[PDB]
Curated annotation (Swiss-Prot):
Name this protein carries in UniProt: ATP-dependent DNA/RNA helicase DHX36
Region annotation (Required for G4-DNA- and G4-RNA-binding) ranges: 1-46
EC number: 3.6.4.12, 3.6.4.13
Record keywords, A-Z: Acetylation, Activator, Antiviral defense, ATP-binding, Cell projection, Chromosome, Cytoplasm, Developmental protein, Differentiation, DNA-binding, Helicase, Hydrolase, Immunity, Innate immunity, Magnesium, Metal-binding, Mitochondrion, Nucleotide-binding, Nucleus, Phosphoprotein, Repeat, Repressor, RNA-binding, Telomere, Transcription, Transcription regulation, Translation regulation, Transport
Pfam families reported for this sequence: DEAD (PF00270), HA2_C (PF21010), HA2_N (PF04408), Helicase_C (PF00271), OB_NTP_bind (PF07717)
Subcellular location as annotated: Nucleus; Cytoplasm; Cytoplasm, Cytosol; Cytoplasm, Stress granule
Region (Necessary for interaction with single-stranded DNA at the 3'-end of the G4-DNA structure): 134-186, 367-426, 507-566, 718-729, 739-769
DNA sequence: AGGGTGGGGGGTGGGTTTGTTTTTT
DNA sequence: GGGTGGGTAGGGTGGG
């Protein structure tokens, strides 16, 4: 027999057996004999202040503290451009200010406008509002400005900041408000014209954030209605002319920066000076990227490497003319798919012996490289004494390793920091002088066709290289090392892809309609680098299925509440159903956690211990979002004992104190909006009146399934075959796997063979980052279109033509009819919210449904 | 994303993870 | 080579 014939036929025999085994593993759905009678019976019934500011400023000029602080402000490069910055702003409506690193344009341009208005006399008719891209940056900048003017932030002074759940608002007339980009967008709902604001300043707009792009376009549109409004942009050199052309060829400023001189060494220079010989047998390559990445640029990437291959032979010949032959072969036979950790380890060794005192900071793409490099350094004998200290940096590290990096060190310590791209944004070490830049960064994309979000490693853009280089020469002259040849440095991308072209455009689509800006499709055409038509059409269609939008995008009453809730549309529906079923407190904690981070932090050395503690918190719920509730519940009880007990609890279970505190403040915000709508009767999320079904884990799982319904996976289990194995499938993805960080990674005793996930990614294989099992009743009611069929087994009932259970015809008919009554009741309740009373006979469909979910179940199959 | 108790027919088949950032009154 | 490793994540120009 042919080899292909026997192999192909063998699959058919195995495939038939597998199909014939899944049909016998379907869960049976039946309730009772007495319960059916109850359901059937119910179903049959269906002026002087302006001048006072000038006097106050003159009096403050004699303060000793103010004079001392003013002397330092003179050294800033932006001080010399005070005449030009103030005069041009008062003339043109739109101005662009571009400056290199070192000039304090963020803390000086804002003060220049206020000082000019106060001195000229009409200083009470201005209100400068400055937008910052980070919560920490807003706080730090405001405090620095307050100390510069010899005042205190907030408390009715001339400066302040406002962020989420924290606002030290200054006085009304004059004053400066530093707020994140999100705050300004929320203001547009009340007053779309942004009145009572004289100057609006947008800084750090070169990062091309998601919310920054929306605000910039809205301001441009609003400019016509408000001729007297002045808006100032702040880019960072490079491609600063793009913003000028967008706004209509506005004037530009080129404020020079200030930085100590630095020297840049490429791959050829580093190898030649340190004489690095690669290890033998290390050239064994791997699969040549057998993934076929579907990135947005795709063809742009395919093009750039084409020139690189073409110019490769020419560049190599020129290199041999200058450098030695030994270094030429090393750079030629170097893998470009991964950073050479051996080269970095050798480079750090050379710096210690030869170069002078300083701090070394190295950028790495991800955790895998951070843990690998830390092993190479710790393995060697030299990097083990008390002299050298290594402080890894990552988001998952406990409180970014506290404040060890901030503290200075005596001579000889030579602290070494291994960090991801978290240190380049805002970490303020203020001590490093040698910077090693592994030219690889991790980017998150989104495929409009596969409807999945991937994550891979990409070469750093020319802007990222400049940002990393600028962290060395700030307080002392230093050195910057780049791990790529001169050919790569010329072919690097000028900028990263804007966030508007990546990430799903789901929350942004609802934000457009709540602001009455346009028609979603028309508004997403004046944005710089507008998204592709495929992504816009898919987002609208997905919202239509969720029923957040009408047949002609009219913002159905359900969608109104989703837009005003600062969460994703899927998460927002979970919050709304939590108040309807009176399971408020546990649901709010899950929604807050799903919206922003988890309170679990894993240190470097202890990775296996951290996973063991997380499984202990899960108890026997076989759930991932229920561990957050269990962790939060324990933390609250521990805090009652005392402050000392709370610290011990977080350390024992590797929890994060700051994240848990933020999650507690987020819960109160959600309940405040619900009270205004009318779903609840109090602002306290832990109201005993609205926490009736709060101690039941079955009701909570049903509510979660109501929110994240379309994401459902199968737990098809293969019996035997040595150790037990579980294969997880998806309707549109084929075969997926559970991420090792999840609780259910190694679980093989699932009561029901179904899951619900929230976040999935295609880093290397399709992964589910969190999943919880669901009973069949949780899918029958809060699911798709119920259908009754017959496939020679029984009166099988399907919710989406692929989720199939087993039930008799009589029972299945009752369940389908009950679902129809619930949908009508649920729609009416959302349109006219009410606290709902559990001591009446008006609409008891919810009461009957709760009894079915709470009781019965226990299929265990 | 299968085992090493198949076999080393090939590695151009595959053999566990983990950029950061944001939201009125 | 095996077939309970998979052909809904390998291939037959790898073998039976």
């Amino acid at each position: 027999l042919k080899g292909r014939e026997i192999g192909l036929w063998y699959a058919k025999k195995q495939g038939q057996k597998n199909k014939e085994a899944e049909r016998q593993e379907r869960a049976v759905v039946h309730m009772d004999e007495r319960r059916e009678e109850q359901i059937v019976q119910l179903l049959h019934s269906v002026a002087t202040l302006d001048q006072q500011l000038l006097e106050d400023l003159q009096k403050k000029k004699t303060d000793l503290r103010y004079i001392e602080m003013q002397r330092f402000r003179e050294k800033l490069p932006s001080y010399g451009m005070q005449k030009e910055l103030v005069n041009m702003i008062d003339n043109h409506q739109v101005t662009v200010i571009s400056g290199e690193t070192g000039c304090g344009k963020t803390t000086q341009v804002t003060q220049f406008i206020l000082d000019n208005y106060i001195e000229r006399g009409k200083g009470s008719a201005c209100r400068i509002v400055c937008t910052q891209p980070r919560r920490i940056s807003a706080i730090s900048v405001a405090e620095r400005v307050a100390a510069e003017r010899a005042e205190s932030c907030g408390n009715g002074n001339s400066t302040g900041y406002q962020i989420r759940l924290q606002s030290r608002l200054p006085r009304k007339q004059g004053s400066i408000l530093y707020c994140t980009t999100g705050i300004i967008l929320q203001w547009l709902q009340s007053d779309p014209h942004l009145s009572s604001v004289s100057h609006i300043v947008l800084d750090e707009i070169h990062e091309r954030n998601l919310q920054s792009d929306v605000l910039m376009t809205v301001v441009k549109d609003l400019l016509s209605y408000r001729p007297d409004l002045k808006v100032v942009l702040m880019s960072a050199t490079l491609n600063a002319e793009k913003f000028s052309e967008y706004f209509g060829n506005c004037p530009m400023i080129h404020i020079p920066g200030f930085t100590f001189p630095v020297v840049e060494y490429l791959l050829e220079d580093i190898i030649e000076k340190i004489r690095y010989v690669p290890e033998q047998k290390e050239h064994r390559s791997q699969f040549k990227k057998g993934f076929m990445q579907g990135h947005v640029n795709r063809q742009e990437k395919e093009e750039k490497e084409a020139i690189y291959k073409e110019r490769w032979p020419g560049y190599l010949r020129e290199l041999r003319q200058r450098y030695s032959a030994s270094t030429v072969d090393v750079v030629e036979m170097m893998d470009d798919e991964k950073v050479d950790l051996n080269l970095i380890a050798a480079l750090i060794r050379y710096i210690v012996l030869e170069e002078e005192d300083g701090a070394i900071l190295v950028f790495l793409p991800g955790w895998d490289n951070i843990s690998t490099l830390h092993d190479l350094l710790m393995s060697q004998v030299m990097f083990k004494s008390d002299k050298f200290i290594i402080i890894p940096l990552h988001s998952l590290m406990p409180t970014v390793n506290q404040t060890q990096v901030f503290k200075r060190t005596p001579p000889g310590v030579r602290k070494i920091v291994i960090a991801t791209n978290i240190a380049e944004t805002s970490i303020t070490i203020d001590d490093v002088v040698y910077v090693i830049d592994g030219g690889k960064i991790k980017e998150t994309h989104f495929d409009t066709q596969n409807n999945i979000s991937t994550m891979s490693a990409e070469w750093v853009s020319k802007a990222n290289a400049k940002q990393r280089k600028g962290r060395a020469g700030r307080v002392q002259p230093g050195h910057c090392y780049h791990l790529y040849n001169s050919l790569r440095a010329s072919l690097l991308d000028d900028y990263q892809l804007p966030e508007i072209l990546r990430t799903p455009l789901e929350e942004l689509c609802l934000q457009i309609k709540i602001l009455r800006l346009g028609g979603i499709a028309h508004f997403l055409s004046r944005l710089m680098d507008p998204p592709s038509n495929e992504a816009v059409l898919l987002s609208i269609k997905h919202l239509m299925e969720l029923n957040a939008l009408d047949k002609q995008e009219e913002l159905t009453p359900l969608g109104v509440h989703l837009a005003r809730l600062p969460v994703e549309p899927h998460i927002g529906k979970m919050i709304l159903f939590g108040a309807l079923f009176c399971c408020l407190d546990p649901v709010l904690t899950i929604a807050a956690s799903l919206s922003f981070k988890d309170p679990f932090v894993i240190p470097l050395g202890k990775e296996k211990v951290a996973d063991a503690r997380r499984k202990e918190l899960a108890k026997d719920t076989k759930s991932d979002h229920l561990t957050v509730v269990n962790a939060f519940k324990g933390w609250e009880k521990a805090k009652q004992r005392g402050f000392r007990y709370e610290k011990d609890y977080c350390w024992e279970y590797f929890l994060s104190s700051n994240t848990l505190q933020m999650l507690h403040n987020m819960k109160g915000q959600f309940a405040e909006h619900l009270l205004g709508a009318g779903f609840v009767s109090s602002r306290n999320p832990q109201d005993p009146e609205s926490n009736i079904n709060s101690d039941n884990e079955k009701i909570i799982k049903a509510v979660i399934c109501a929110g994240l319904y379309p994401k459902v996976a199968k737990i098809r289990l293969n019996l035997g075959k040595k150790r037990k194995m579980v294969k997880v499938y998806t309707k549109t993805d084929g075969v997926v796997a559970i991420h090792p960080k999840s609780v259910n990674v190694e679980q093989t005793e699932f009561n029901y063979n179904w899951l619900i996930y929230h976040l999935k990614m295609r880093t290397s294989s399709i992964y589910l980052y969190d999943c919880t099992e669901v009973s069949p009743y949780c899918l029958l009611f809060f699911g798709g279109d119920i259908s009754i069929q017959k496939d020679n087994d029984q009166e099988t009932i399907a919710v989406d033509e692929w989720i199939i259970f087993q039930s008799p015809a009589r029972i299945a008919h009752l369940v389908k009819e009950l679902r129809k009554e619930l949908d009508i009741l649920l729609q009416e309740k959302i349109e006219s919210p009410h606290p709902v009373d559990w001591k009446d006979t008006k609409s008891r469909d919810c009461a009957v449904l709760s009894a079915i979910i709470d009781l019965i179940k226990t299929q265990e199959k």
